[PDB]
């Protein structure tokens, strides 16, 4: 009714839904693709993909289980999904996979069939998924020589250099209990799981903490992947944003909300009450964009992302947009702010209140790791609404106005201008 949180060594967390047809259990390791290193990159995405190799996934397929997995930057998750009654059928199959079995998934016929498929995997991504590719490199340059930089799915380089002796090197350090959280989502009780958990003995590497690295940092920089053979142009730009559990966590998400997200095709999109939109549409400066305030444990990235078949006029594209961003400091309409608060809520909803347990897991697992607990929607909303204009005019005033940016891109970006232009559009001339 307010989400449960109790620890007997294994911090056991759950979240009940009485109208759910199914449920899900799993673990979340409080160390992700940003706890790795330059040459072991993709180790966390390698771990995910053995966990779903036909072997272990045929086991749980007779049982009636489905497994879910994802790696982030600050965190890393291993979830299993099934019918709510077969709730022990989950917990046991989890127990087998992470304390019982070890080299049953770590075969020299398994691992050389997973790594020979996480290699094709990260060779369609950087090959044909430019919007994320661009998005990923954006981190690489903004957070260069620092934790967040390492692409979550790992470089094809440090991904052909890795054997099983390396899957473990990360496992036995960062796959602990004092870095994990067990989650219960969907259609199960707190007294169903934490019972079935204290039912099982053993302890893996107790007392052990996972290790640390130099805290992340940010620096104004570019990286440009020109490719004049690609029909469009993809660009992503940002400033040093705000972390998870930062005073302006919501203030910053409200700002993103204002300019928001465009799709020049859906007539619905064309009518949004966004000021910037007035400009961009005249000549069709782009095909779409969208904003964001990506928050991570140590640092953040407020900016936006755009694709465009309009090559001669990208220079305006970036211009109109970064000028709008100036208003946030000097001239944002209050009535804009309300449409923000309003729309944030709708978005922040379909995020948190989707009828899909697997999401409510990672969400829970990550948050109850970093701050300890989760924060309720009513808590969030109570904050969103407190937000004045002055909220947004002092946040932009430090974060946005005349601060270093972080551009990245690919496709026909000859037209995308230089760094002393772009960066300079962070401000406006004053008397």
């Amino acid at each position: 009714a307010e989400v449960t949180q109790l620890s007997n060594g294994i911090v056991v967390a759950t979240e009940h839904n009485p109208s759910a047809h199914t449920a899900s259990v799993g673990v979340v390791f409080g160390s992700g693709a940003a706890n790795e290193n330059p040459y072991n990159n993709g180790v966390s995405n390698l771990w995910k993909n053995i966990f779903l190799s036909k072997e272990n996934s045929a086991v749980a397929a007779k049982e009636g289980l489905a497994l879910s997995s994802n790696i982030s930057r600050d965190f890393q998750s291993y979830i299993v999904s099934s019918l709510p009654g077969s709730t022990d059928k989950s917990l046991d199959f989890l127990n087998q996979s992470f304390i019982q079995q070890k080299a049953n998934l770590l075969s020299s016929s398994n691992f050389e069939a997973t790594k020979k498929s996480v290699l094709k995997q990260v060779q369609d991504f950087e090959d044909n998924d430019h919007p994320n590719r661009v998005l990923e490199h954006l981190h690489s340059t903004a957070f260069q020589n620092t934790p967040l930089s390492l692409p979550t799915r790992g470089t094809l380089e440090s991904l052909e250099n890795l054997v099983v002796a390396d899957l473990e090197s990360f496992a036995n350090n960062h796959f602990l209990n004092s870095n994990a959280v067990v989650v219960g989502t969907g259609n199960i009780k707190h007294e169903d799981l934490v019972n079935s958990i204290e039912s099982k003995n053993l302890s893996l590497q107790t007392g052990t903490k996972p290790v640390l690295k130099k805290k992340a940092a940010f620096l104004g920089s570019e990286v440009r992947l020109r490719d004049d053979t690609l029909p469009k142009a993809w660009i992503s730009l940002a400033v040093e944003g705000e972390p998870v559990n930062s005073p302006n966590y919501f203030v910053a998400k409200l700002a993103a909300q204002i300019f928001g997200s465009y799709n020049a095709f859906e007539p619905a999109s064309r009518l949004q009450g966004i000021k910037l939109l007035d400009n961009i549409q005249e000549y069709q400066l782009c095909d779409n964009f969208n904003h964001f305030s990506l928050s991570y444990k140590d640092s953040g990235l407020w900016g936006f992302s755009t694709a465009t078949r309009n090559v001669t006029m990208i220079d305006d594209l970036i211009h109109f947009t970064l000028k709008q961003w100036n208003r946030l400091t000097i001239s944002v309409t209050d009535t804009e702010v309300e449409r923000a608060k309003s729309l944030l809520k709708l978005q922040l909803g379909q995020l948190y209140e989707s009828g899909n347990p697997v999401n409510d897991a990672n969400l829970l697992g990550a948050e109850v790791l970093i701050k300890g607990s989760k924060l309720s929607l009513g808590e969030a909303f109570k904050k969103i609404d407190a937000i004045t204009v002055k909220d947004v005019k002092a946040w932009a005033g430090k974060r946005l106005w005349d601060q270093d940016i972080a551009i990245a891109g690919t496709g026909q970006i000859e037209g995308l201008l230089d760094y002393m232009r772009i960066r300079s559009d962070m401000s406006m001339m004053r008397w």
Partner: protein
């Protein structure tokens, strides 16, 4: 588009002094035409101002 590009007058200004695409590699030798236009302006200002007292 931006105004400086759109205006009948400022578009020239932009396209010859602001948005002009120069080779990335050119050195201080190329600063001569610039400094050439500057003399011509020094010639014409000071000349006129002097002519006011010349016979």
């Amino acid at each position: 588009m931006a105004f400086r590009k759109s205006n009948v007058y400022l578009s020239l200004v932009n396209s010859y002094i602001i948005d002009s695409p120069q080779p990335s590699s050119i050195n201080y030798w190329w600063n001569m035409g610039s400094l050439l236009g500057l003399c011509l302006v020094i010639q014409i200002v000071t000349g006129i101002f002097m002519a006011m007292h010349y016979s």
